[PDB]
């Protein structure tokens, strides 16, 4: 019915690794970290052509051959009615199910090295409890695990031959394997494939029902453009092999902006440190400053992610469950309510408090004289933002402890706090902030055309721009 867990012990680069699973699993990570040794653990468990050759000396952890290789898979089995695959499992097993534990199942693999015959024999077991695992019965070359699961392993003129072979594999799985549970194991399907065909494969792989169970390893962000109801597994590049898992779902409130979120997050899943910014003006300024200071930041795993008109929870939950460092730089805004005059809501502080795990604050009301408008109304609103930022100081300190960086007014006032003598020199006005805020996309290009070295360092080692030092990762300790 549903996969739940896999526990891999004493295999090739897994010492003791427990991974929560689902149907539609996507595993990703770095080079030489163990993505295809995860799929060979599924081939040794469920496919007979890999299992018939046994284990070598090199299939053990650090060439030891004194530990036991143990690979255990957990199945959920909670829906006996209406699902045909639960009947397909239950009609073969017949003797190791218990009525008290009828909504869990375990399929285990054990191996101990001989060191006389130089051979690792593979013994398979099932059960409904983790103790009392009886052996899977079998006669000859065939046991009863091969009557249930069929494993299709896909690994690649060119291009059109591979998309023909996908239709040949789907035609053989539709015709010959109606009575079996089919699991696809796909190893890097972006090889010699055009990116429109990658988006077409992503749409067919996540929207259609012909791929019920797969394990997908990939390097391509364009083949995760349509991801929904999936389990994302990230293999970490540290000194210990850690695999993190997230149950990726898209909410019904985000369903009108789903493709924008999926493109932006699917580019950001292959990084190590992700900075979350608002719009393209921050992208222009931070790309100029990170070009001048640390120009190999995206080689080393940094990413600039522009997120706009959202509430930060989806990206932070997906990056935090996968073990990816997220930094948020934002500014507090006073959004005016529809159909109401003089009543504002505290939008950036509500976004940071909704990220921290709190509720939204009450709607504030500030009143102005009606003749006083223009630049004086913005100065009254900036003084109200400064009073909000002064009175909520202990919340701002615990935003700062959770790598959330809220500005006092805006980005432009922090930029005037850093390089504002150069902003007086370039724009030649008495208000360099307001001329930058008149046309934001054209005066930022005009500003970054005229900065040079030691203005980007004045942006970089300022105390209001510690998000860039978090994104690069250089620490004093």
């Amino acid at each position: 019915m549903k996969f739940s867990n896999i526990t891999i012990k004493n295999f090739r680069n897994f010492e003791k690794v427990n991974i929560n699973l689902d149907n539609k699993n996507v595993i990703f990570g770095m080079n030489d970290i163990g993505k295809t040794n995860f799929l060979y653990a599924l081939r040794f468990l469920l496919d007979k052509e890999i299992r018939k050759f046994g284990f070598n000396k090199s299939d053990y952890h650090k060439h030891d051959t004194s530990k036991k290789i143990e690979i255990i898979l957990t199945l959920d089995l909670s829906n006996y009615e209406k699902d045909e695959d639960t009947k397909k499992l239950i009609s073969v097993v017949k003797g190791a199910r218990t009525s008290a534990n009828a909504d869990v199942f375990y399929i285990a693999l054990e191996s101990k090295y001989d060191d006389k015959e130089l051979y690792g024999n593979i013994i398979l077991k099932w059960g409904s409890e983790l103790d009392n695992l009886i052996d899977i019965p079998g006669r000859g070359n065939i046991n009863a695990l091969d009557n249930v699961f069929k494993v299709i392993y896909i690994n690649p003129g060119d291009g059109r031959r591979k998309m023909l072979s996908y239709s040949i594999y789907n035609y053989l799985a539709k015709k010959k394997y109606e009575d079996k549970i089919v699991i696809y194991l796909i190893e890097e399907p972006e090889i010699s494939l055009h990116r429109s065909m990658q988006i077409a494969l992503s749409k067919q792989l996540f929207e259609q029902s012909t791929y019920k169970y797969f394990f997908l390893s990939t390097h391509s962000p364009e083949l995760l453009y349509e991801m929904d109801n999936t389990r994302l597994i990230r293999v970490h590049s540290t000194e210990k092999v850690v695999c993190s898992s997230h149950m990726y779902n898209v909410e019904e409130a985000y369903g009108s902006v789903k493709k924008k979120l999926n493109k932006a997050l699917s580019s950001a899943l292959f990084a190590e440190r992700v900075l979350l910014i608002e719009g393209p003006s921050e992208k222009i300024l931070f790309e100029k400053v990170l070009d001048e200071v640390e120009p190999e930041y995206e080689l080393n795993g940094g990413f600039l992610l522009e997120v706009g008109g959202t509430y930060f929870n989806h990206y932070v939950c997906t990056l935090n469950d996968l073990g990816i460092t997220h930094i948020i730089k934002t500014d507090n805004d006073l959004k005016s309510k529809k159909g109401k005059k003089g009543v504002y809501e505290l939008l950036g502080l509500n976004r940071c408090l909704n990220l921290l795990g709190r509720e939204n604050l009450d709607e504030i009301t500030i009143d102005i004289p009606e003749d006083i408008k223009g630049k004086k109304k913005k100065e009254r609103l900036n003084e109200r933002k400064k009073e909000i930022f002064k009175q909520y100081k202990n919340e701002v300190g615990e935003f700062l402890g959770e790598r959330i960086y809220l500005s006092e007014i805006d980005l432009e006032n922090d930029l005037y706090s850093a390089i504002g003598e150069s902003m007086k020199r370039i724009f030649e006005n008495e208000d360099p902030v307001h001329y930058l805020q008149k046309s934001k996309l054209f005066n930022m290009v005009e500003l970054v055309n005229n900065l040079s070295t030691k203005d980007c360092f004045d942006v970089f080692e300022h105390e209001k721009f510690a998000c860039l030092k978090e994104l690069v990762g250089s620490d004093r300790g």
């Binding site: 006996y80 009947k87 239950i90 009609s91 199910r97 009525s99 009828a102 009575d179 079996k180």
Partner: protein, 200 residues
Amino acid sequence: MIEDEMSREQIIKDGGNILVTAGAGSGKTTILVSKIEADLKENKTHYSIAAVTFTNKAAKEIEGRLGYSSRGNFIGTNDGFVESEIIRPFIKDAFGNDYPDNFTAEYFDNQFASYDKGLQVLKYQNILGTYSNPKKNFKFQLALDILKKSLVARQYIFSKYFKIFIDEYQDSDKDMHNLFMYLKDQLKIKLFIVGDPKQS
């Protein structure tokens, strides 16, 4: 063409419960193996069928007429079907681990004719006897009791077995009829019953 092919389309392409008013013998084995090979031809899913006879000579004659099947189809006697499909995988799950797994049918010594002394000699002496009344079935009553008790036995015989083909219904007890009615009404298994015209 015409009514012969129409009658063959009626009697081959059925899918429901079958009850044919035909006599014992007289070529019923050939139409039974034709119905068995038509049901094995017409099925494409993972389900399996069962065939219940009395004697081993008709069982090996039916096994000679089919040959080899890799779908897990069971052909055998009633005591072997109850012992190898109901009693042995589910006695440890229904009545605990105190009862033994392996057992032999030796009724040449014990002539005990009660259920309570029968359950205490499966508990203590670990052997089964036979009733003094010859119209009794202790094993079919035990199979009905552990099919009423166990959940995973009902799940297995709902998931695997599709139809049961019954031979020689003219000499049978009411407990076998009660167990086959219990398989018929709840767990949705069709029945193929041959019989007699009158007495015999």
